Amino acid sequence: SDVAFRGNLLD
Amino acid sequence: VPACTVSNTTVDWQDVEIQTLSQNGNHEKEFTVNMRCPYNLGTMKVTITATNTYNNAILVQNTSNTSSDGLLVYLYNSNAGNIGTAITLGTPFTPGKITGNNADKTISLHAKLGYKGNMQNLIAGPFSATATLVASYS
């Protein structure tokens, strides 16, 4: 199966 | 023997301020992976692979002005809730934290965010990456 990595980089 | 059936999961960091990123990796985050292992005699071996990598870290696409640079995701084994040894992609390791006395197993891992290239070249905005995880007992 899979593991997703996510987020939001902010300046 | 039959390999375990791994359930998909997501590790979400929410908002991450670029200025706070450590090149070596910080923003440590613990996460779990659930799986169904009909055959669970012996010890579990897990192997994690990814299509885009850099020196044993997952290289997140479209996160730097330079396409070959960018955000990095480093993975680590777990030792009783404490971060353990780094995981080498493509090689087997035995999870240090496994729960579930039945076929339903859950392992704990840790991940850190780092980056390749200059911090000033990092691109703000939503990012996403994926890795494949296989597991089986032996």
Inter-chain touch A5–B128, beta carbons under 8 Å: yes
Cross-chain residue pair A4–B113, CB shorter than 8 Å: no
- Whether the CA torsion B114, B51, B43, B9 is positive or negative: it is positive
Method: X-ray
Contact call for residues B77 and B87 (beta carbons, < 8 A): yes
* Residues sharing a CB contact under 8 Å with residue B38, sequence separation 6 or more, in sequence order: B2, B4, B103
Cα angle value B54/B60/B62 (rounded, 5°): 120
Which helix (H) or strand (E) is B111 found in, with range? strand B104-116
Q: Is B73 exposed, middle or buried (0-12, 13-18, 19+ CB in 10 A)?
A: buried
**Closest in B11, B127, B129 to A9, CB measured:** B127
Cα–Cα dist B32/B24, whole Å:
23
CB atoms within 10 A of CB B3: 14
Contact at CB, B8 and A8, closer than 8 angstroms: no
For this entry, resolution in Å reads 1.9
Tally of CA atoms within 13 A in the half-sphere of B50 that contains its CB = 24
CB nearest A10 (choices: B16, B128, B132): B16
Domains identified in chain B and CATH numbers: 1-138 (2.60.40.1090)
Q: Give the Cα separation of B48 and B33 in Å (integer).
A: 12
